[PDB]
Ligand SMILES: O=C(O)c1ccc(Oc2cccc(COc3cccc(-c4c(C(=O)O)[nH]c5ccccc45)c3)c2)cc1
Ligand SMILES: O=C(O)c1ccc(Oc2cccc(COc3cccc(-c4c(C(=O)O)[nH]c5ccccc45)c3)c2)cc1
Ligand SMILES: O=C(O)c1ccc(Oc2cccc(COc3cccc(-c4c(C(=O)O)[nH]c5ccccc45)c3)c2)cc1
Ligand SMILES: O=C(O)c1ccc(Oc2cccc(COc3cccc(-c4c(C(=O)O)[nH]c5ccccc45)c3)c2)cc1
Ligand SMILES: O=C(O)c1ccc(Oc2cccc(COc3cccc(-c4c(C(=O)O)[nH]c5ccccc45)c3)c2)cc1
Ligand SMILES: O=C(O)c1ccc(Oc2cccc(COc3cccc(-c4c(C(=O)O)[nH]c5ccccc45)c3)c2)cc1
Ligand SMILES: O=C(O)c1ccc(Oc2cccc(COc3cccc(-c4c(C(=O)O)[nH]c5ccccc45)c3)c2)cc1
Ligand SMILES: O=C(O)c1ccc(Oc2cccc(COc3cccc(-c4c(C(=O)O)[nH]c5ccccc45)c3)c2)cc1
Ligand SMILES: [Cl-]
Ligand SMILES: [Cl-]
Ligand SMILES: [Cl-]
């Protein structure tokens with residue numbers, strides 16, 4: 001596509017997109033075009049508005065485009081073209097990516113006892129309500145545990161909420177503790193969001209006992 | 213995929229899918245699995261049910277799966293595996309395709325006068341509310357008009373309703389009437405549904421006058 | 425989207441799209457934009473060309489866009505904007521839909537004997553190499569057989585070729601012949617293409633014997 | 637979906653997926669099923685193989701599934717079900733995610749001079765050949781620069797190679813340097829892969845002069 005301003009918009013929240021170059025108040029020669037999950041290719045929106053699109057995205061007095069409550073289908077591209085009172089045309093180009101933050105992740109079915117030298121189920125980490133899916137990962141004593149290295153194995157599951165579309169992730173950790181190791185290790189699980197710069201979320205630790 | 217029974221399900225209507233081989237009433241060893249626009253790959257549904265899926269698809273006393281109001285995202289594959297009281301396992305495999313019937317098509321901006329030997333805009337046909345999109349076509353004196361043959365031009369547009377997903381189609385017809393032709397031709401437009409065996413819908417005719 | 429000329433382009437064949445309004449030969453102020461399965465949103469192509477796109481779509485001396493061999497990923501929208509020597513701007517807007525014609529359909533595993541009053545497997549119809557998928561249907565004595573009416577049942581299967589993407593369809597017909605019926609019925613199967621105005625293809629008939 | 641082992645497979649490289657529980661050499665009662673970008677829902681692959689799938693994915697003597705050169709369309713789910721010589725059934729479930737590493741990122745059009753207190757174009761960072769797309773970000777003196785905080789502006793562009801599908805990313809940085817700031821700041825750009833635990837790639841720094 002073209003160069004654009006990246007916009008990250010949280011599901012359910014309003015979004016206001018600026019029409020660069022527009023007169024501050026009507027009358028305004030401006031047009032918005034958007035290609036999102038709602039549209040077949042580009043849809044043009046005008047200041048007068050009208051129709052079912054009024055429920056979804058409407059042009060404000062100052063020419064900005066307003067969505068009262070962003071949803072997954074609003075992901076896409078939003079563009080404005082305006083003329084000011086002199087006649088200079090100005091373009092605005094936005095790439096809108098939608099997200100939701102899940103609840104704090106939780107560990108379920110955690111083991112209280114591990115045996116060294118054999119594979120053990122440590123626990124299952126669960127995260128509910130993310131978009132995009134994101135990923136879960138495990139840590140041992142503040143260091144990331146890497147699947148398929150050093151007796152670590154992980155299995156993963158992804159489900160979607162049937163009405164909201166939001167993701168639930170599950171991650172099952174097994175480890176083979178090394179003989180003569182730490183007898184009270186500390187494990188935890190973290191959720192890493194899909195979009196850049198969004199913060200990770202972490203579970204409470206679990207501290208099994210390891211038997212030599 | 214595998215062999216399946218094709219099911220066509222109208223948007224907004226209920227759908228009941230039979231679990232072949234299931235005992236007529238509980239207790240029943242049966243499981244439904246579905247992969248639709250709602251799911252990440254396969255989702256398993258059990259007779260006890262539970263959770264958010266209860267709002268969408270639930271197993272009936274006789275083991276059938278019930279959706280109170282089908283939507284676009286229920287398109288996909290629905291399977292049942294049952295054991296009867298003896299131990300015979302029986303599979304059910306359904307490919308569910310969703311549709312909606314648009315309103316009767318309408319011609320707008322129809323021409324009252326055509327000039328022979330030059331291109332004329334005859335009219336614009338509009339169909340609102342279909343799924344899948346379907347197509348519009350034009351007829352002249354009960355015979356199909358073929359675009360880019362014999363001085364016929366057609367342009368087409370597709371839009372989607374922002375909340376329902378249903379399609380609105382527009383088709384603009386231009387013709388160059390042949391000299392010495394019928395002076396009161398009869399044009400009409402038809403909507404052809406996307407799914408097989410669904411009936412076409414037709415507009416009222418228009419009867420312009422052609423000037424030699 | 426906007427009004428456009430519909431273009432149907434057969435896979436593997438060349439496609440030439442006209443840039444309306446362009447000067448017949450260089451120099452030409454024209455630009456092509458396309459959004460297809462190959463692109464992230466819109467890609468701009470210029471007369472000078474250059475790069476990997478030269479292998480796929482290149483601007484001709486007369487300003488038309490040339491694709492030497494259309495593929496499934498060329499489905500999408502293709503637009504031109506040209507200025508003539510005076511300064512009139514002219515737009516060209518094309519919606520390109522790709523297709524392939526399968527081989528003639530064939531019936532396999534046809535039954536030689538049917539018993540009246542009980543369900544019988546009549547045969548399996550197979551079509552290989554279509555795009556879009558299209559559909560198969562059955563006929564009895566030159567009339568369409570409707571699944572789930574009058575002792576008819578059909579099961580269907582769709583597969584894709586792993587490298588070409590083209591569809592293979594299979595359709596299994598079972599019928600319960602009515603007692604005292606025609607003792608040498610004639611069945612056949614037809615492939616119906618997905619795009620409008622494309623012709624159906626039909627199998628050779630089969631003529632089982634029916635036993636009262 | 638179900639619990640699965642996550643597999644990350646580099647485009648163009650071979651992939652071997654183990655059929656857990658299978659006998660070490662024929663005869664083997666095992667079956668692979670896969671749902672990927674190549675398939676319409678599930679495709680079953682058998683030890684005898686055969687057909688066009690032999691070019692893509694074939695079962696080895698030890699029952700593993702072998703793809704000689706993974707492509708984007710092999711993303712998806714791969715399952716095995718085996719019985720050993722005793723009769724024990726064993727399942728294998730793999731979620732295969734494909735990737736490619738881009739070339740080292742490069743800064744182009746870098747500025748030699750910045751003026752403090754006014755917006756300046758610092759440069760454009762480009763990354764070629766990634767899958768999935770991944771993201772670019774900017775750093776100032778070893779700290780991440782956050783768009784739309786403290787006089788920082790970023791615009792982004794994504795394109796796809798028309799034949800390979802791989803992504804090229806561009807990121808244009810503008811900054812308003814703070815008065816009385818460091819007169820020789822150090823900027824750099826980093827590519828962050830889409831999949832977890834894959835390493836970032838970083839550009840050589842640029843060191844413009846800032847004029848008070
Ligand atoms: O679900 C729904 O129904 C729904 C959705 C969104 C929504 O919020 C809004 C979102 C955007 C904008 C607004 C104000 O728009 C207005 C109100 C009054 C005049 C105008 C308008 C102005 C001018 O602005 O003076 N110049 C114009 C020039 C040409 C044509 C129209 C205008 C715009 C309200 C409200 C309801
Ligand atoms: O911060 C920003 O907003 C921003 C960031 C980067 C940026 O680079 C670009 C420079 C030139 C072109 C482009 C893509 O084409 C664009 C972008 C925006 C509006 C339009 C546009 C055009 C028309 O042009 O025909 N008609 C329109 C009618 C209605 C609404 C929009 C348009 C086309 C992108 C432009 C703005
Ligand atoms: O507005 C909408 O679209 C919407 C409407 C309703 C809604 O909740 C439902 C969702 C799905 C299906 C249904 C009903 O089928 C149902 C639902 C629940 C139980 C039964 C049922 C009854 C009995 O009913 O006595 N005995 C049972 C015994 C065994 C198993 C089931 C039942 C039948 C209700 C969710 C959304
Ligand atoms: O009219 C019909 O319903 C019908 C039409 C054609 C037809 O051909 C087929 C024959 C065999 C297999 C298939 C696909 O696999 C299927 C089909 C249905 C259920 C299952 C299944 C299996 C499991 O098998 O492991 N576990 C399950 C657990 C829960 C729910 C379903 C299944 C697998 C299709 C079968 C039924
Ligand atoms: O796979 C591949 O590599 C491949 C793909 C497609 C292909 O066929 C073609 C497809 C389209 C066009 C052509 C001629 O283009 C040409 C040849 C010579 C000059 C120009 C050209 C002309 C002018 O035309 O005089 N004015 C121009 C004005 C500005 C910039 C360039 C030109 C165009 C060849 C050939 C190879
Ligand atoms: O037969 C036909 O070709 C045809 C059929 C219907 C038809 O209706 C339309 C009327 C107006 C607008 C539209 C969509 O927008 C279009 C259509 C075509 C080119 C452009 C365009 C614009 C720009 O406009 O900024 N810049 C461009 C730069 C490069 C290449 C194309 C464009 C925009 C469609 C137009 C032509
Ligand atoms: O350019 C490409 O991407 C491309 C490359 C190669 C190609 O054909 C192949 C496709 C998939 C896999 C392979 C090999 O694994 C294979 C293939 C065939 C047989 C065997 C094999 C051998 C034995 O080999 O002795 N004994 C066997 C005994 C039992 C089962 C298999 C084998 C191993 C070859 C298709 C495309
Ligand atoms: O490390 C691993 O491999 C692994 C990780 C997690 C894991 O959890 C699961 C436990 C049970 C079920 C599942 C999903 O269903 C699966 C998984 C694998 C094969 C099958 C399967 C079935 C059939 O079952 O009818 N027929 C088949 C025929 C051919 C090929 C595969 C199957 C079904 C997942 C299983 C294995
Ligand atoms: Cl799910
Ligand atoms: Cl639309
Ligand atoms: Cl397939």
Ligand SMILES: [Cl-]
Nearest residue numbers: 463464795796
């Ligand atoms: Cl692109």
